[PDB]
Amino acid sequence: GEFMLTTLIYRSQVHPDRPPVDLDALVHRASSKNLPLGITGILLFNGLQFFQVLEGTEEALESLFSEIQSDPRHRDVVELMRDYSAYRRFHGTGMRILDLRLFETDGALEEILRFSTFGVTEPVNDRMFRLLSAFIADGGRYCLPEPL
Numbered sequence: 069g070e071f072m073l074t075t076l077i078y079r080s081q082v083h084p085d086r087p088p089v090d091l092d093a094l095v096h097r098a099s100s101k102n103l104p105l106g107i108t109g110i111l112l113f114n115g116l117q118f119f120q121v122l123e124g125t126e127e128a129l130e131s132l133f134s135e136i137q138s139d140p141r142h143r144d145v146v147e148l149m150r151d152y153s154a155y156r157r158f159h160g161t162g163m164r165i166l167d168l169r170l171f172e173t174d175g176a177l178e179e180i181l182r183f184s185t186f187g188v189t190e191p192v193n194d195r196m197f198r199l200l201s202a203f204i205a206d207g208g209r210y211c212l213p214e215p216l
């Protein structure tokens with residue numbers, strides 16, 4: 069049957085001691101799976117963590133995200149979100165990592181936008197964007213506000 073959409077989002081880590089990730093091959097094998105699965109989204113990397121924006125059938129988001137925590141690469145993958153939806157923000161891009169090590173807060177965020185075609189109501193109070201920009205902004209444990 070035809071079931072409504074959903075947006076699951078999660079974030080993990082990586083090997084702080086071992087070498088970098090194959091963020092080219094890592095996302096490639098992912099898109100190939102999510103595409104036919106009907107899933108869509110974007111991945112991120114800051115040299116320590118992985119942020120993924122999954123948007124598709126809830127039944128797929130769970131299993132997928134479950135396949136993720138079963139991976140040996142990262143480690144602390146935790147469900148950041150999971151909200152009901154009726155539309156797809158990323159139309160055409162099944163999976164696409166974002167080596168933030170290349171961009172920055174406003175930079176990386178721009179990346180998403182340029183290929184996100186986000187035309188929803190408003191990315192403002194967007195539950196997903198909350199996390200998305202939080203990873204782009206803080207990338208894990210901030211230190212800008214409240215000094216010593």
Ligand SMILES: Cc1cc2nc3c(=O)[nH]c(=O)nc-3n(C[C@H](O)[C@H](O)[C@H](O)COP(=O)(O)O)c2cc1C
Nearest residue numbers: 093094097098099101102118120132136139141142
């Ligand atoms: C950090 C990380 C994130 C992943 N994210 C996804 C994902 O969002 N969707 C997906 O279908 N597979 C995902 N995968 C799984 C890979 O796409 C792929 O299955 C893996 O690189 C090895 O596949 P193989 O055992 O079939 O060779 C992820 C793997 C890693 C290490």
